Symmetry: C3
Subunit: 488 residues, 3 copies
């Protein structure tokens, strides 16, 4: 006496947003944005980071006496540094092309220290200088990877030193030039006035001269030390020549292995954990195409946006009924699929569920979500560059570029989710109506529409007849004759 | 008796573009692109800008004698500068890190001039030097904020000077080095050869040597003056030492205010008006989310898109054509109460009507759609504008390409959104009308007859109350079922 | 009798991808991505390129003796250069601001070499110096466009020279400074010790001092030679002055065309063709909006995308299976005259036809959609290739990041747009067919019988004329109202 069409309802209270209506309660949803992190600084793919502590890159490479534990550092995954490290250049001065050196370090995973110029080779100079700026146990000291050359007796012969790169791969060499305060300092230390420092390779030619002038006292001294670096290629030679004011290197840094790394500015300490994507705030264990944790991440991190909510609609609208049809609303007791029928024949009732339509819809929505998710191209992220106080325009350019790309991706994500939600919520209603129309057109003129969602039979359509009606194979003539009799 | 389903039509002539069709006429439309301006330069939030006139930034800061009106400048919101200022470096020369100085000036908004090295302190030199390039009333003169040190008698003692920044904020200081033409000028001015100019701070250490060489004559002189600048931090000392060829500063520029500003490149003047957004052509008084007036802007402004028409569709399609039939032909021109409605023609009389629920639902949907489109855009206090020297062409190309790419991306996004939501809205209205027709048909069942034009022909006698119930959902099939079979037979 | 409604099917095997399903076969498809080139380097707009061979830009401009084929070069469309040229600076040294010079050369289409300082005006210096690094047939030689100045007798007077730019356009001038190895070399070549080189223009002021030190041997020499360049404006003068170590110029390079070009890093030669776009792999001849050949192109051509397939679905879904059934069972292979149509079987035969109005409307809509996704692209003569030095790694990373980001954005846009448009068109065709069926049903009404498959059995007798009457849309309902009532019962 009754076969009806209706859809599925449940107790879900998930809300998605479309472009024509907000706060739409749905049965099934899927968040595609992650907002959680572990909160600890961990190991990236099992490799511990380089914990500099309160030391700077310059202090580590030059051998600041306070950074004595960073003398034989092993493999590392990324560098952990403080915003304002305390122990950098103990002797006041500058470091030429510091940011370029940091950028180079952003792609190096190991260093091996090679003794290129031994300290005892300077048989005609004094190699025991020091200062109270870099002092250990009260007594003066100096950088542990550099040599300060001073006159022996009352003479400063021309100092010449050379090295040929027979180590195996590229080498990093740092030297410095000392600028005294007054003329008496220069005469006491180097015995000559008008000195020069010459450094030359196959691709480098630099000659520097000292500057003597009264300067404001930094760390109790009016003198400065300017440091420079170069990258010595394989099978190349470097030459040193100076009549005074030379801080000769004693060790060279050889690149052992290369890879993808970065410098992360955190004030934390490493803890025992293993991670893949590491933000300055904590680790991430995710699979979604979006997150809103931190922009400057290191690793394989999906995507950063300023959207606080991105939920895709995977199911139908939750419209409880207050046997009716799909005009009134969904059904609570039809837990077998998505779309289905209901019947009340002589034998017994029961909430069935159509299989082909539900399967087709499930495949379509699954393909939709997979297409949205699996079109992101996530690569290694190591963004974050350092700029000097005389490169503000470049810093502004970088900031604007990142901001613009972020805004574009945010707009794309929000547009995609809204339009997709609207299309899916229309798709489900279209499928329900298609099923009802197919059933009605196959049944033809042996039934009576009731205007609420379903029919009333003009004949005794038994259980096999009923399954045939749902099967799609309903014989019209073989029950036609009786229907005409009752309808009239 | 009869009843029909139809929609609204009027005498609008607006046009929207869809992806499937061009030049579609609609009843209602919304414009979300601003293309007009007042053609004036006004004050931003009540604070007038700085009008340099024919003076450059270097001429203002160095104290050009022809820029004397700028010796004491109040607070500003932005700076107006001509493309090729005439009154600049009166004495020929250069200015190291000029573009960086301008970029710093882009976020300053106020300065205070503080006398750090008074001119009378140089008791062992001469401080009354002037050139005919920077001449006032015929006699020679010089920059008003700088001091030219020259030998006193027949001797040039070592010149020393210092300043401790006890003012409370960062200070900007400019010095200079003089490059003569020949050796006799060097001997006449400084009495010795092989000189130096040394400047040192806590983070700066610079030494310079003058260059003596014959040069092409600019402004009648072959000599040049090179200027440099620095930013002195709080509680920090600057030291000056020179054996000759030093143009010492007399004043320092303290940063009083700080904020978002910029440098406009215009040849116009200031006019008595107010605004919240600015372009080099004129101000913009708008609330729409997009504009296409000028890329260069100062303040919170609608996003720039290379577009000429961005119109959303709010109402329905326009088919003026209309016994009165239904929606098969077109809309009704007399149903001014809403968007969807009916038409009842019982024996008592006739009259159009509008259904409230569908109209309210469609109105809410359209309104929130336009809200979603408009409100998903972030506008900040962008301060577009940057200068590059003649040795940084690659940087200028990079900046131009970045800006052009981002603008193009945003234009494409906005255009595609508008073009797709228009078609979605039209399909929405068609579907809503069809849904109303189908609901009425299903509630009416076989009590009526369809004539194939959106209308129904009632079989019984439907009075005014009967039709009122029909357009209400309170229509009872059994109450008229018994007589209904008689008419069909 | 009977009249059935269905769509058209053929034997196509083209596939498109939607956002709800994959592996979807369609009747007609359009490819908008070009994946093939010509494989050869050819002329652009009839103008042959400039083939540097094994020479570099520095070697060509300076006058390297190996690059003697380029002492007179005609107008060019673009420059082809190798990744690691062999014949560059024969004398070891360096070239200041090389990348800026290449960037400037990326916008110049012709040069006119002009003799600005002849070699015979140096009447007090020797001008016949050479080296074994730049050797022609064993004997030492030197750069063809530069002059090496050496002491005459035992004296090196002050070298002085000047040129006034009266040519008619901007000029390029290159000069060099020589750094010896030991003091003996300096005394042998220039007599005096402690020399200088000064070059000055209206906007340039430089003073270089030679550096004497022992350096690793490159090309058998420990000495080096440093080169600098400048751009001299019209009606301007350049002054040279030196006491030693001056590599004076003899020719200037006047810019004479000033168009749009570039430098292509290729390792191939030139053939005899004529193209419009030129990628390093080969030439492109197409009229499509996309290609995936190479990121760097020269000329005008489609936009680059990192993808493998972009197919637009124009036709209908291809289901083969079809008394005759209708669109519900599937399409037909018989009526190849349109997309949607009717099928009738009356007493005087049977056949197929097509509804012209619906097919025309769908065709225009699809063409508008295709042209709207194609014509919204912004195409321009853009420059991509840029060069950076070993101390400019951050800038190179910035440029690479910007290019990769824009490429990813546009690729994603193209893919998602294609998917969405395919879904819309495949639903649009079904909506059109269903609308046709519903229109015929509403018009035809009670005189007929629906049958499920998608068609209608008449309750009266009909012939061809009635079939056209149904097909055109004018079907007289009352003319069979009495007749259809009799056959109903
Ligand atoms: C070695 C030493 O202590 N020299 C001090 C110098 O004494 C001279 C003696 O060597 C010479 O033969 O005879 C004269 C008298 O005719 C002295 O007795 O006297 C100077 C002042 O008169 C000291 O000045 C102070 O030096 C301080 C710096 O000392 C240190 C430092 O703590 O940084 C450490 C070393 O003593 C000193 N020398 C070396 C070779 O390392 C270095 C060096 O002077 C600079 O750091 C680098 O140029 O610095 C302060 O600079 C203080 O301001 C100053 O007055 C000599 O220390
Ligand atoms: C002060 C003055 O006018 N000096 C001129 C100089 O006079 C010599 C005087 O110093 C000496 O004691 O006695 C002899 C006679 O025994 C002279 O009277 O003579 C020069 C020519 O031989 C002039 O040179 C010309 O200077 C021009 C520029 O004039 C100014 C200027 O307006 O820029 C005048 C300024 O008074 C002068 N001094 C100062 C401190 O600013 C400057 C200065 O010399 C230049 O700026 C140096 O770069 O120049 C032209 O340059 C012209 O080409 C040149 O011949 C002396 O003006
Ligand atoms: C012109 C010449 O042959 N010079 C050689 C020099 O000559 C001496 C002469 O100056 C002196 O008065 O008398 C003695 C005999 O009593 C010599 O005849 O002697 C040098 C060695 O003692 C040679 O040195 C070698 O030069 C090599 C380079 O030759 C070239 C070159 O290929 O670069 C060519 C020319 O000799 C010269 N160019 C000129 C003069 O215009 C350049 C010149 O040295 C540049 O400064 C290159 O740096 O050198 C190698 O450099 C080799 O290492 C060196 O020992 C002189 O060739
Ligand atoms: C939707 O729900 C949120 C709570 O999650 C509420 O803040 C917001 O106001 C709601 N929207 C409307 C239009 O009421
Ligand atoms: C450096 O050592 C390598 C070892 O193979 C050698 O070939 C090269 O000539 C050396 N360099 C110099 C300048 O001797
Ligand atoms: C329903 O269709 C299935 C097709 O898999 C068939 O196996 C089954 O026998 C059918 N049942 C009836 C009652 O027709
Ligand atoms: C649409 O109208 C504009 C002017 O309003 C006209 O230029 C354009 O050709 C029209 N397009 C079509 C397809 O009619
Ligand atoms: C500069 O002034 C501050 C505050 O008055 C003071 O602490 C500092 O010592 C001064 N500098 C010097 C070098 O005395
Ligand atoms: C129309 O429907 C409303 C529903 O709230 C009801 O209150 C009203 O009585 C109805 N009017 C008639 C005439 O049935
Ligand atoms: C579609 O067909 C291609 C082969 O042309 C195949 O590689 C791809 O996997 C197919 N898509 C799906 C979803 O199977
Ligand atoms: C260079 O030539 C132009 C035109 O011939 C002339 O006006 C100018 O004065 C000349 N330059 C010099 C320095 O004389």
């Amino acid at each position: 006496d009754q076969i009806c069409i209706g859809y599925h309802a449940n107790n879900s209270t998930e809300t998605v947003d479309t472009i024509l209506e907000r706060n739409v309660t749905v049965t099934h949803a899927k968040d595609i944005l992650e907002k959680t992190h572990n909160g600890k600084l961990c190991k990236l793919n099992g490799i511990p980071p380089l914990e500099l502590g309160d030391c700077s890159i310059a202090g580590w490479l030059l051998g600041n006496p306070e950074c004595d534990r960073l003398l034989s550092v092993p493999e590392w995954s990324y560098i952990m540094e403080k915003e304002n490290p305390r122990d950098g250049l103990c002797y006041p001065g500058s470091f030429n092309d510091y940011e370029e050196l940091k950028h180079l370090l952003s792609s190096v995973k190991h260093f091996e220290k090679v003794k290129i110029l031994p300290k005892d080779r300077w048989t005609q100079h004094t190699t025991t200088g020091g200062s109270m700026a870099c002092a250990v146990s009260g007594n003066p000291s100096f950088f542990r990877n550099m040599v300060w050359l001073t006159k022996k007796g009352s003479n400063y012969p021309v100092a010449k030193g050379s090295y040929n790169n027979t180590s195996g791969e590229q080498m990093l060499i740092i030297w410095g030039v000392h600028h005294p305060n007054d003329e008496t300092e220069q005469r006491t230390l180097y015995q000559n006035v008008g000195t020069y420092v010459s450094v030359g390779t196959s691709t480098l030619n630099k000659r520097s001269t000292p500057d003597i002038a009264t300067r404001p006292k930094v760390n109790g001294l009016g003198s400065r030390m300017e440091f420079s670096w170069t990258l010595l290629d394989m099978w190349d030679t470097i030459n040193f020549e100076s009549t005074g004011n030379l801080i000769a290197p004693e060790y060279g840094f050889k690149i052992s292995k290369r890879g993808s790394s970065g410098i992360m500015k955190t004030e934390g300490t490493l803890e025992n954990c293993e991670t893949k994507c590491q933000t300055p705030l904590g680790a991430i264990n995710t699979t979604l195409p979006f997150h809103n944790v931190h922009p400057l991440t290191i690793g394989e991190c999906p995507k950063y946006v300023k959207s606080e909510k991105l939920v895709l609609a995977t199911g139908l609208r939750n419209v409880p009924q207050i046997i009716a049809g799909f005009i009134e609303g969904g059904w609570q007791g039809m837990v077998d699929g998505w779309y289905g029928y209901h019947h009340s024949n002589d034998q017994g009732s029961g909430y069935a569920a159509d299989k082909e339509s539900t399967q087709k819809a499930f495949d379509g929505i699954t393909n939709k979500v997979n297409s949205v998710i699996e079109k992101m191209n996530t690569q290694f992220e190591a963004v974050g560059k350092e700029f000097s106080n005389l490169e503000r325009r470049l810093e502004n350019l970088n900031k604007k570029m990142e901001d613009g790309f972020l805004d574009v991706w945010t707009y794309n994500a929000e547009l995609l989710v809204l339009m997709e939600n609207e299309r899916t919520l229309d798709f489900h209603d279209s499928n329900v109506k298609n099923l009802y129309d197919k059933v009605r057109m196959q049944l033809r003129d042996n039934v009576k529409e009731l205007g609420n969602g379903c029919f009333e039979f003009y004949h005794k359509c038994d259980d096999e007849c009923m399954n045939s009606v749902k099967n799609g194979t309903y014989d019209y003539p073989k029950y036609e004759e009786e229907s005409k009799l009752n309808r009239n």
